[PDB]
Design a protein around this ligand. Structure first.
Ligand SMILES: */C=C/C1=C(C)C(=O)N/C1=C\c1[nH]c(/C=C2\N=C(C[C@H]3NC(=O)C(C(*)=C)=C3C)C(C)=C2CCC(=O)O)c(CCC(=O)O)c1C
Ligand SMILES: */C=C/C1=C(C)C(=O)N/C1=C\c1[nH]c(/C=C2\N=C(C[C@H]3NC(=O)C(C(*)=C)=C3C)C(C)=C2CCC(=O)O)c(CCC(=O)O)c1C
Ligand SMILES: *[C@@H](C)C1=C(C)C(=O)N/C1=C\c1[nH]c(/C=C2N=C(/C=C3\NC(=O)C(CC)=C3C)C(C)=C\2CCC(=O)O)c(CCC(=O)O)c1C
Ligand SMILES: *[C@@H](C)C1=C(C)C(=O)N/C1=C\c1[nH]c(/C=C2N=C(/C=C3\NC(=O)C(CC)=C3C)C(C)=C\2CCC(=O)O)c(CCC(=O)O)c1C
Ligand SMILES: *[C@@H](C)[C@H]1/C(=C/c2[nH]c(/C=C3N=C(/C=C4\NC(=O)C(CC)=C4C)C(C)=C\3CCC(=O)O)c(CCC(=O)O)c2C)NC(=O)[C@@H]1C
Ligand SMILES: *[C@@H](C)[C@H]1/C(=C/c2[nH]c(/C=C3N=C(/C=C4\NC(=O)C(CC)=C4C)C(C)=C\3CCC(=O)O)c(CCC(=O)O)c2C)NC(=O)[C@@H]1C
Ligand SMILES: *[C@H](C)[C@H]1/C(=C/c2[nH]c(/C=C3N=C(/C=C4\NC(=O)C(CC)=C4C)C(C)=C\3CCC(=O)O)c(CCC(=O)O)c2C)NC(=O)[C@@H]1C
Ligand SMILES: *[C@H](C)[C@H]1/C(=C/c2[nH]c(/C=C3N=C(/C=C4\NC(=O)C(CC)=C4C)C(C)=C\3CCC(=O)O)c(CCC(=O)O)c2C)NC(=O)[C@@H]1C
Lengths: 80, 162, 68, 163
């Protein structure tokens, strides 16, 4: 359980070839490609607004359409 | 409040987990597709059982749907962190501890979570192995089946628990 | 231009075989066949909005995939 | 603002008024039911190819600007979906595109970025319509929707031209 409904936000920065400098990492240099690479992790509250939820319902309600090339499991009858 | 692992610390981290660079690619394949992974899972759960958005169903109303979309994202993110860490301890404690009981008390249906989590698992495995329709991230071509299976194992812990 | 930033939101219901939703929203006459009497299109001019949470999640995806 | 429901006799009539009505409805279903991804993938593709767009001087910097761009991309997608429902682009060309280039010029919304977001949505919609998946992994009866895909492509080309 987590009372605040926080989850780990993991961010992956492969900044090889990225000409913008970032220096949030404060530890020692590796003197190789890892100086242009960073993983960021933080614990953040996860939230979804009812407005977003309403938009998702409108996407989901047709009950037939899918992503491209995925299994079809739709049914027209109550399962549970 | 955030931790930054770059330079020497990242060089070290890559040696403390198996297949460090591939593992970071695999994590990337999850986190850069987070919104659609959550969407497919809740959408598919619903198209298989449309009663979930009938007036008596557990995703009826924007409040209930928003909670389900939120919970799916939470579960997905603890899985992504397990894959980064090569360790499921935080997932098992912080995320899954007390969750089955919680859902039992609320009436959040186990068959619905079984299906949603199952779809997230398939979708993540496909992104990691690059069998999905979209292959937007750039990696050297190779065999990531071990990391994909490790990821699937973390989802299987979720399913088992619920 | 639309001052209210509306767009047409279309929903497509192929509800052939659905027994549990009463087909009452469509108020016109029947066709006499399932392909039309158990199918419906909904169209509504709607103010299009994107909430902070949705935008924030897209930004998180972007930040982990920027091309060098 | 009022929702319209078209079923029964009225839907049968609509299918006499537009070409390939059933296929058209399937195409619209695919696009609307995947709209959030179509939009987010286009806007995030525009950004991942040009990361300056979310640097502090970039036009998508901050949630407010990202939200406005996602919204506008959705507006455009929806007017295209409606064009595909209707069989023509008149509403798209008037309500959506009329004055839009000038609006964007007054706000400083970048033409190159818009061309790319629209271009990605185009490719995505064309691919949903010309989906070559096996029937087992296809929600609609398999067949040839190339005419409708080309029609859809044409509507996006009108957006690209206007902007
Ligand atoms: C996140 C969006 C996706 C992009 C972009 C992409 O390239 N692929 C994407 C999604 C994706 N989905 C799956 C697997 C499944 N999706 C569903 C739900 C879907 N099926 C339905 O019948 C309905 C309702 C009409 C849906 C919304 C299901 C059931 C699956 C398969 C789950 C399983 O096998 O257990 C994948 C993985 C495809 C694969 O496994 O080969 C991707 C990549
Ligand atoms: C998200 C909706 C989709 C579902 C569900 C699905 O199954 N496929 C979906 C989307 C889709 N996208 C494309 C094409 C492109 N998407 C991007 C953006 C992507 N690429 C990047 O480099 C980054 C940033 C790292 C992204 C976020 C791009 C650039 C394209 C290609 C556009 C072009 O061709 O010019 C398609 C089309 C695939 C096809 O043509 O067959 C789909 C279906
Ligand atoms: C190259 C892709 C690029 C161009 C060109 C441009 O205009 N902007 C670009 C990248 C970019 N990066 C970020 C945000 C972060 N980059 C990070 C990477 C590192 N941090 C470090 O300390 C190190 C050395 C080990 C890295 C390789 C991190 C951690 C980012 C997040 C910081 C945070 O927590 O906010 C952005 C977002 C805008 C910004 O914050 O600068 C952009 C556009
Ligand atoms: C069968 C798929 C099903 C089960 C089982 C279940 O529990 N719920 C099911 C379907 C379902 N449908 C809807 C909403 C709408 N269905 C519509 C279809 C038609 N309406 C008509 O008048 C006709 C005749 C031409 C149709 C084919 C429409 C238009 C719906 C939207 C209503 C609206 O805009 O509010 C839902 C959502 C919950 C509900 O309204 O029952 C569900 C779960
Ligand atoms: C399955 C996961 C997919 C796959 C992966 C794959 N990746 C590599 C090699 C590398 N990947 C990276 C990526 C990163 N390192 C970082 O520090 C960061 C940011 C935090 C990232 C994103 C790196 C640096 C490498 C090394 C090669 C290079 O110099 O770029 C391989 C090659 C084998 C290996 O172990 O190195 C593979 C196979 N490949 C696929 O086909 C899957 C879709
Ligand atoms: C390209 C668009 C994709 C494709 C489509 C395709 N669809 C059909 C056949 C049918 N589609 C429907 C769908 C509806 N009719 C409705 O009234 C509604 C709700 C408003 C929907 C969703 C119908 C009724 C048919 C007729 C056959 C049937 O009943 O199953 C075809 C077959 C050819 C035709 O025109 O009938 C095709 C090719 N197929 C693809 O492969 C593309 C991905
Ligand atoms: C979505 C796939 C399914 C679904 C979900 C659903 N969940 C709730 C409500 C809650 N969910 C939680 C979950 C957690 N607590 C934790 O500590 C953690 C780990 C960090 C998690 C994931 C909690 C605490 C609640 C109650 C409090 C809250 O909602 O904020 C609901 C709402 C139930 C209600 O009626 O209020 C729903 C709908 N529903 C489904 O049908 C899917 C199977
Ligand atoms: C996203 C791909 C691009 C982008 C978008 C962006 N748009 C705005 C602001 C506005 N957009 C409109 C658009 C319309 N007016 C109309 O009448 C119609 C047809 C119905 C449309 C689509 C308007 C009126 C505005 C101003 C009002 C408002 O934004 O609420 C912004 C700026 C938002 C801001 O200034 O805070 C942005 C960023 N930006 C990009 O970089 C992409 C190329």
């Amino acid at each position: 359980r987590d009372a605040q409904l926080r989850a780990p936000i993991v961010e992956i920065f492969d900044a090889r070839g990225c000409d913008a400098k970032n220096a949030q990492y404060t530890g020692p240099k590796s003197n190789d490609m890892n100086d242009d690479q960073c993983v960021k992790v933080s614990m953040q509250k996860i939230t979804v607004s009812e407005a977003t939820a309403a938009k998702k319902l409108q996407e989901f309600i047709g009950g037939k359409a899918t992503a491209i090339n995925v299994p079809i499991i739709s049914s027209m009858t109550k399962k549970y | 409040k955030a931790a930054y692992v770059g330079g020497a610390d990242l060089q070290a981290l890559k040696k403390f987990v198996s297949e460090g660079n591939k593992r970071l690619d695999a994590v990337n394949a999850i986190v850069s597709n987070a919104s659609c992974i959550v969407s497919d899972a809740v959408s598919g759960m619903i198209c298989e059982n449309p009663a979930l958005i009938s007036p008596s169903g557990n995703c009826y109303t924007n409040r209930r749907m928003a909670a389900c979309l939120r919970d799916a994202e939470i579960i997905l993110r603890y899985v992504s962190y397990s894959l980064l860490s090569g360790d499921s301890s935080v997932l098992e404690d912080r995320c899954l501890g007390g969750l089955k009981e919680t859902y039992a008390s609320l009436g959040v249906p186990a068959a619905g979570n079984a299906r949603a989590v199952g779809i997230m698992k398939a979708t993540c495995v496909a992104f990691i192995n690059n069998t999905s329709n979209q292959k937007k991230l750039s990696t050297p071509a190779g065999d990531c089946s071990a990391l994909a299976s490790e990821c699937a194992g973390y989802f299987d812990k979720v399913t088992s628990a619920l | 231009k639309d001052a209210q930033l509306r767009a047409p939101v279309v929903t497509i219901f192929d509800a052939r075989g659905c027994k549990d939703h009463a087909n009452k929203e469509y108020t016109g006459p029947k066709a006499g066949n399932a392909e039309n009497d158990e199918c419906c299109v909904k169209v509504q001019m709607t103010p299009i909005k994107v909430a902070d949470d949705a935008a924030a999640l897209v930004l998180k995806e972007c930040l982990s995939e920027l091309k060098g």
